Amino acid sequence: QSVLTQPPSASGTPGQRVTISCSGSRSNLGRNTVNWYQQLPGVAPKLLIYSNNRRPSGVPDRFSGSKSDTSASLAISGLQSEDEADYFCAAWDDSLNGLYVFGTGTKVTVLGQPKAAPSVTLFPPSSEELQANKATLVCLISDFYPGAVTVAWKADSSPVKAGVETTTPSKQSNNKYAASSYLSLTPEQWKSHRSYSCQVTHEGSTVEKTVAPT
């Protein structure tokens, strides 16, 4: 599939209105309608919105959807604990033989404590890993709340295609969250670029660390 971009985390207190954006492109949202799904652990996604703004029977009216040209939005008014879940937009995309593309997903949290911004540590590949013909960049992310982030990697200033693996956030002893992300490269890729960056997005913050082979 492709990429519909969503913020990692949307949060509020009880009764507040939360909104979730979805950013796509000409080939998907430009030419097709959008659906919204509510996703709970261990079960199939539940359809909340189809055809941009229509609710299936049984879905309360406090969920509503809107769609622009290549952007879409889901609004959850009267935030309740029961609404805590992951939410995914999705649209057909006219590329290749036809693809159904899900968004990256947005965790909705009813805030149980103040927000907390992530700390980020980035390690370059070790000389001995490079001696074993491999290269791994390590991005460690700690002390954030709510428990969802996006990790994007850059080579110089361009987003990296492949080789990225990222954990789901896990709760620390102090009830904030931690996660980690790994970028796998050949030694040639590592040595041939000027720099690589780990960029972490969380609520109202972005933190980016950069390392260089020289």
Partner: protein, 219 residues
């Protein structure tokens, strides 16, 4: 009235073929683009592919080398086969009837989802690399060990044979698309101790009967 029901082994052997079927009731097999999606634990939703009753198929390009889908109109069923599975294919598999051209008025229909776990008796011991402390002031430095490409869980990491406990932070492992795990353990230490104090990570991976001690030194 429309009902989709997934069916197939919930526990499957690695390298063998993962098979699931979906039975459709209350709707004609021609009314939808019949589809499979999956969600590995802790990850996002991934569309696997869609099939129409004529046999037209479109597959996620990241799975097309190992995925086949089929439709049996006399049983009102459709099915997926996923070859050469690893732990990376453990996931909630959900079937659905998707409306390609938004021709049906009620939107798509969804099954219940089923968590399928890929089981393997195989093992692989970790590679261990140092995450060296940079060249740190003022105050504290971070150093650690990267424990890469092992299977199955768990591994345990200690520092200086358990004498070093404060400032230690071992991060839960990532499961890579190869089906192997990796994790990092990092300790924060006084910058003033780097030239003098020895720091050794002790990695134990009992399933492979592997142990590694790695001295983590500056540079």
């Amino acid at each position: 009235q429309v009902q989709l029901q997934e069916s197939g082994p919930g526990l499957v052997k690695s390298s063998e073929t993962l098979s699931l079927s979906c039975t459709v009731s209350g709707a004609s097999i021609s009314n939808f683009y019949w589809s499979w999606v999956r969600q590995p634990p802790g990850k996002g939703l991934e569309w696997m592919g869609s099939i129409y009753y004529t046999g037209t198929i479109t597959y996620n390009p990241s799975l097309k080398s190992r995925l086949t889908m089929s439709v049996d109109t006399s049983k009102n069923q459709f099915s997926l086969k996923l070859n050469s599975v690893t732990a990376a294919d453990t996931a909630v598999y959900s079937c659905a009837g998707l409306d390609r051209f938004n021709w049906n008025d009620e939107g798509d229909c969804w099954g219940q989802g089923t968590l399928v776990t890929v089981f393997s008796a195989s093992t692989k011991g970790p590679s261990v690399f140092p995450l060296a402390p940079s060249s740190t002031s003022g105050g504290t430095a971070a150093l650690g060990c990267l424990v890469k490409d092992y299977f199955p869980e768990p591994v345990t990491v200690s520092w200086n044979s358990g004498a070093l406990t404060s400032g230690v932070h071992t991060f839960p492992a990532v499961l890579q698309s190869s089906g192997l795990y990796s994790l990092s353990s990092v300790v924060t230490v006084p910058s003033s101790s780097l030239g003098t104090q020895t720091y050794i990570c002790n990695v134990n991976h009992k399933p492979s009967n592997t142990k590694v001690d790695k001295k983590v030194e500056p540079k």
